[PDB]
Write a protein that binds this DNA or RNA. Sequence first.
RNA 1: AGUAGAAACAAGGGCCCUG
Lengths: 545, 51, 97, 552, 50, 712
Amino acid sequence: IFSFLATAADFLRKENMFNEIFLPDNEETIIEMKKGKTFLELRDESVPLPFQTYEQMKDYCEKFKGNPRELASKVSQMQSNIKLPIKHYEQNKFRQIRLPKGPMAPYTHKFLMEEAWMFTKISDPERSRAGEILIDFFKKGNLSAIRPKDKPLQGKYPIHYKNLWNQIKAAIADRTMVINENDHSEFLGGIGRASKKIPEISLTQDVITTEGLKQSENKLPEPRSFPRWFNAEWMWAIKDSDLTGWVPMAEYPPADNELEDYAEHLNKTMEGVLQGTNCAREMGKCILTVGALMTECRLFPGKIKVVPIYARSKERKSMQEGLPVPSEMDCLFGICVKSKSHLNKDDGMYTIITFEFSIREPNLEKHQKYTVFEAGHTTVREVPLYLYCRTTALSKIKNDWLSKARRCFITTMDTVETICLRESAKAEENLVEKTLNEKQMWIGKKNGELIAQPLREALRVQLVQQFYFCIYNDSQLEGFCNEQKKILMALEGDKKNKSSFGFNPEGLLEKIEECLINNPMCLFMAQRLNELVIEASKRGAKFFK
Amino acid sequence: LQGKYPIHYKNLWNQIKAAIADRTMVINENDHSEFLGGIGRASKKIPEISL
Amino acid sequence: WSKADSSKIYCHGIAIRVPLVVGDEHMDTSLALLEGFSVCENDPRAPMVTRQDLIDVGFGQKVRLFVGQGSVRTFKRTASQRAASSDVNKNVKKIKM
Amino acid sequence: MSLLLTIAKEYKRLCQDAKAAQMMTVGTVSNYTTFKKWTTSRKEKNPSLRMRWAMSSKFPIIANKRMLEEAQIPKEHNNVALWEDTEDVSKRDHVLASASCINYWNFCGPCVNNSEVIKEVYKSRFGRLERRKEIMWKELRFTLVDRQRRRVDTQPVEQRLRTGEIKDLQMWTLFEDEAPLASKFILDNYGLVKEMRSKFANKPLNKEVVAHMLEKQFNPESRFLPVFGAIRPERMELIHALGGETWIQEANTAGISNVDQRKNDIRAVCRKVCLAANASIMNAKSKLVEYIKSTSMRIGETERKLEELILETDDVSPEVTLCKSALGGQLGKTLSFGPMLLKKISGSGVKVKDTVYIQGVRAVQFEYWSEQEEFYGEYKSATALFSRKERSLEWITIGGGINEDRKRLLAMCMIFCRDGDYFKDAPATITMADLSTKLGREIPYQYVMMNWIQKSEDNLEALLYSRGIVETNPGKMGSSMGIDGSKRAIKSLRAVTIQSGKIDMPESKEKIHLELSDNLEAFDSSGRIVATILDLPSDKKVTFQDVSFQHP
Amino acid sequence: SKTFAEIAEAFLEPEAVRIAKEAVEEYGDHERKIIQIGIHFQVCCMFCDE
Amino acid sequence: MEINPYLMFLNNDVTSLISTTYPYTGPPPMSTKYTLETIKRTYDYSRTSVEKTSKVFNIPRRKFCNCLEDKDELVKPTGNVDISSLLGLAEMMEKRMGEGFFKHCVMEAETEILKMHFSRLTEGRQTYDWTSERNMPAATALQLTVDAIKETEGPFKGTTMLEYCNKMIEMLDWKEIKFKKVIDSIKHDEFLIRALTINTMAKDGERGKLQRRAIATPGMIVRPFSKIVETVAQKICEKLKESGLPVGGNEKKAKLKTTVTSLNARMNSDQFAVNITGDNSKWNECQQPEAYLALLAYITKDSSDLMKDLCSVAPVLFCNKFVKLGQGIRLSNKRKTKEVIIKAEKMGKYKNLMREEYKNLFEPLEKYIQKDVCFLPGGMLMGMFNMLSTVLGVSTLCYMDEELKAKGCFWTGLQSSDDFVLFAVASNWSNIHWTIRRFNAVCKLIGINMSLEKSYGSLPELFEFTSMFFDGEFVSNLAMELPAFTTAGVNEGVDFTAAMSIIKTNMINNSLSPSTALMALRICLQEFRATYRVHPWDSRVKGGRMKIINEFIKTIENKDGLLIADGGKLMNNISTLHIPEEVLKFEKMDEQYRNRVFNPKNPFTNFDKENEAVVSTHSFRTRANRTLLNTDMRAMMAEEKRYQMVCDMFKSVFESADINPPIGAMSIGEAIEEKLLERAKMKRDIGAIEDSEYEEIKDIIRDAKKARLESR
RNA sequence: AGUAGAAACAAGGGCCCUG
């Protein structure tokens, strides 16, 4: 008996059931929730209207019987006073989207892509940090040969920018990437801009009447127009860059089966194709510059620093003839500067400054925020030189995400491998190289006609699309890309003669056009979607012109 | 102590004892013997005309 | 038999389960003694000992001991041959009449 | 030792306080668990971000201090810092350090005598590795795959146990001194414990890690996944590298882990003892229980009791079900009608009586269910989804790959629903002798027709003809089935649909406690039968190895 | 788990489980008392000891 | 030339490229105006004006249940319910599933609620403490509530959930409550309001629906009843096939596929099917707790008289909930040089210096308002009750009538929270429309509305459900899981194996292709090397770790056995994603290296507790924050340090406390003392101890026992 | 100045510290 009881007690204690509840005495056999006074007072007060005490509701529910007829009658009644509209798209077509009106949407990315000029040198493995390369490029004298003038082509506060550039050169000469706190930097750094708090306990009506202290009137963004410079950047980011290896990548592991061989082969093809473009160098630039800036913000806050805008690459591989084993290269596009990144909290902001080099004059519509200066001349023969200068800010999140800008490769590889494997399975044969060299994909229009090229060269469009999604990401683009799916699904239904329908498309168009403001990507993609539905109307219904 | 494919040999020894117990020297299942006989060479073959 | 499984005896292929009352040179823990012990009414007079000296007791003696955590009991080196499978079923069948 | 005296002094100092005394005096020891939660509570939203934001610092790691002094870990080895004397706020007995310290320990730190014990700690993963190395890969091909979804096991494991049988095992091997009373599982499985103890005894180890690894060594990871081809844990652990929706990396993996042999042996033993007990007439229940408890079998090295393995396995067979029912073992809601498998998706009903005339006029009662119900069905390499309605097969869909299997499944389904005229007027061929009662035990007309079909193929053809035949309408040519089991024809059967692609097996994490009769027919809180002794092969002779039938 | 009966079946004989279940059904009391009764019953059994 | 990528949607499908739209490759985006607008919409959607007065608070109580009025623009949301129709639908559902169903579920729930320990309330998202009036984790809130109970009347001896609930109930009827602070006391009414109080959090971790930009955070007096209700709701939902909330991934896919097969097999030759993709609106603003109360009363009718009282708590508490206004408004001058900050309780004072919008939105809600709180007597919030709403919704898809069959019409489908899919069948479009209108009406009768813009329909095989688009095939979005291809941020050993496991799961379920998996592996490897400031040996990188790396590298003879965090190369691929590197290199590490990496005596190793990984020196723990160092949040650390000392001492004595929870009738001191004496004897018998030491230990222990028993 | 969104930052705590 004692052994059995010991085993049972151990088991129960292990199950938390060794209490009066499961093992009561004769008396303690009535367990019940200790219904107090206040709880009951409330329960009898939260009851629906027709009842006034929980007892009535309980008696009505415990005895409730089904009367289908009254239910059907109420159903029909509610079905008559509603008049839910049903709209087959074929009869009620989709109008075009109404973009806003006003000035043009200007450049927003922190760094220049097409107008960027860079100085290159050879990389030595010993000197590989930024604070070192920024000096190496400084000794040869070109970085010091620059000497802008007090007369800017466009912009504001040119004196501050000039003094800041002079201080940057001086600090570089001192071998210390540091800057002192003067009036100029304090202004172009907003060092004293934060508002001074005033407690209410110390407040009075006379104080208010002295200086108006009304509630802040939020000035939401203002509209813009369609940018005409986006296609230029998109077409420039599709061509080679005279070098490769712009984006660092790891090594390939061994292989034992055909699967890994196939994967490695395809990955090598795609990586070699993509690493030569221009968008790639911008990705590498962002990666490295953001890494350096994050390190600095972590180590040297409360201190103005100097960080370069650079990248590392490798000259292309010619034939065995000539100098074999091509060398590496360190490229420098401009200079960057931070300002007291006291990142007390995520989503914060630390102002920075961008000094970049270019050889192309600006446009008022596009390069609106920049403040350009005429610097001098540089070789290639000699050509004039410009200095684009502006101000902006960043945060922890944008840093972390920009540093992680290698996801576009994953997405593109997914799409391509999917297409190729689907085409290969329908025929039960290795159709990958053929699908990459032959299968044509629409890209754009020229002279009112369509244009096409093999997937092997169309990958670049998807890559740039993903990169821009990573760059211009905001709430506006989020909502847009979330609300455009309906249109694509309706289009697919149109392609397959599926008689689609909807309840209120006008509201959908309204929701879409609501989130199109001063964000170039949304405007561009919306215009392109309109052009899509137009081109398809020649082959499909459900769209108005 | 030193070997390459111990599991195959072990399962095959168990199968041998089982077969002897059954009074028949035969082995029905062909997974280990097949492997260890094909490790030398085993593959498909494509006709030249389909090339 | 084998030193690995010292709790079995193979005769003509058939297996036999030896109880665990005493431990020879091979058996090297109290695990071999647990089928010789059992629980009994608590007695504060008996001594309190460890799980290793548990082998130096005499058959039929009592001793206090610590079990698991936060638990003390009293054990006696006397076994109980039967298990619940028979003492319940029989008494049950004696009720359907 | 002196450490013990220090622990005593600390306990004394702590009891001198009032709150510590109140908490160490009130309540039982279980309160400790609770106290273990109110302390050291702090989480983070995006640990990746904070990891890049911290590792960018100088000393982002904490570490013990005395362990470093004893290990002679310096500071500023080669102008690179490793740590600095400080005190973290939470521990108060740890000091900040850098990741470089972790290399400095790995390259010129204290070395232990031996570390092969790791191979035992993580035995499962070294087993994965070995199983991988003993594979002979093959060519790669591209095509579409029929991946069916279902619940399976991905971790090969020997002597699969429960959780209550482990919480104890983790003690007698590692922390024995504070071991609870001996449970039956220990007294029975002594050699197992001795083996697990011989390796992790008198060794310098972290024991929590060992316990976690043992839990993994005794846990079959059950998952609901898409699957293709054979079903064996040895494959599911690396299914990702055998085939997908569009590709297949052929490879032979048959001769490894010797798992299914144990299951087929167990089922054979169960069948044997079930037949034995059926030989009785009034006590087959107690006879079967005695045969069970009077039997054992070997697993690898150890000898285990049958009733113990039966309550650990999950083979849904009409044999294991009976045994697990006799022993009061709960189980899932899975049916069995002969060789086929069944599972109810929705619907309800209740028994109802009806009769049929065998030859001329010979009334024989046969029952059916009076309602609409939907059922999934699985025969060899064939799946089906059908519905029954008041003694009729309303509709059925199939996604198999064979004609023979597709006909046999259809026929057994038609029978399960009592659809057709044969159940209204049986054929002349059947007689009262074939009816039932080999030696007195009756037989419902259902299993009668079952064996009547299994006897001759022409009975099956006639039964199929009992189902309506019509002309294959246009368009439905592809979704049609002839009499031979062809995906298309000019004339096909009635109310049938075919398709390429198996059906996704349903799922339910439910358990039920059923019972059985003196005739070996289990019931589940209703007049429905989940298993019997007529749904298994008639008989066969086998020579069982490493078994103990200690019964007269 | 999922029911007190399955729990009681862990360390008790299913026979006494069914017995105490039928008993509580007779008195129609809360089935959380399946355990105590079964325990008492099993004690009585092992007290007879034949 | 002009470029347009969308042109690829002509010669190709749309699902197999929809992933291109999701901008999940970039950072996603991030009050009182939101809360005030929400309150307004809630009071509006209740289409009536009846009101009562609470004898408790003396506050107007808008009642919206069975009081429908203002039947105009019914297409728009409505939060009024007719209990009769709800109970009818519940009865129909029960009839379908069979009798003894709800009873069986409540029984399965009661089987757990009783044995449950009251410490499982620590797990979960943050809660709103009712003493400091801020959002802390659950553990600390529970600690503070227990401490307050004890300091008021006496320590809480309870060890289960039922006693804690009864104690809460009693505490709702007290008259003076105490609690710790830098030891203020309060009255009954204030504590009541502060308990029914609810706060908000702006986390909305998942992007999902941008409309979701907040989530609720109730107190500690509402957690256990909510857990009970969620448990019963889960036990119910799991039984149903028309629900996909608890399951995840392959399960709902199989559900949909079986449903489609059943549909295509049922409908005759004179019928055609239709699909719909629905996205309900104002879900958490139309579901009413009064209907939930009535439904739970109808359910708990045949079960014990105990469950009837527990389930009935959380409904009335949500029927008498208060909301918290956050941060108040901000004031400023023209130049914005100065700036004043103001809180909610004051907005009633400076109501004239605010924008006309705030005035029009605030003055109406001035009677329902009290100090920095509003008395919302109904509605709901996000995350509070998800499964119960799913049950309430599935009751509709089960509907059937004589009219629907007179025309040969019937609908089915599958619904999760505020997201459903519908499958209607009929013989003509004129009847399809009527069926859909009937469905919309029956859903309107219980506050379940539908969004007319986000919802669309089409022929059978074209629809979407939870970011998964469906056709003949199944398209894995493959962007929903893109962030997962990142280092978790725990330690070095782990993140790599975790990433490989995630890649494996993707390849198995989401049909991730091989080359993509290899690329993701290399990318995660690069990010790992970059995060922890480590690189290979063959590389030329300079820095802290690499310095000593290159220094001691000479001692090695086979780098193929090195680890990544110690200048090692990659040895892993598709066929080796289910194998950590530590295991894959063990057979080649230098005998010295293996012995050093795998030692148990490490000043770094800490256990975390899935954790399919190996342990080594690299399994470290990060530094702890120090911002609190300046804040005076230290008094609370004292009790935590006390509990920690106690726990670590107890563990020093019983080494296994953490992998076998302790049990017994002894206290802690008793067990400690007895075990210490036992060990002392065990050693002195054979081990290196003297009689003097044994006697000293025994004297110390008895003195400590005397002091412990004498202090109190 | 600027950032970005549908609100927040443009350091914060005590001459000294800190993310």
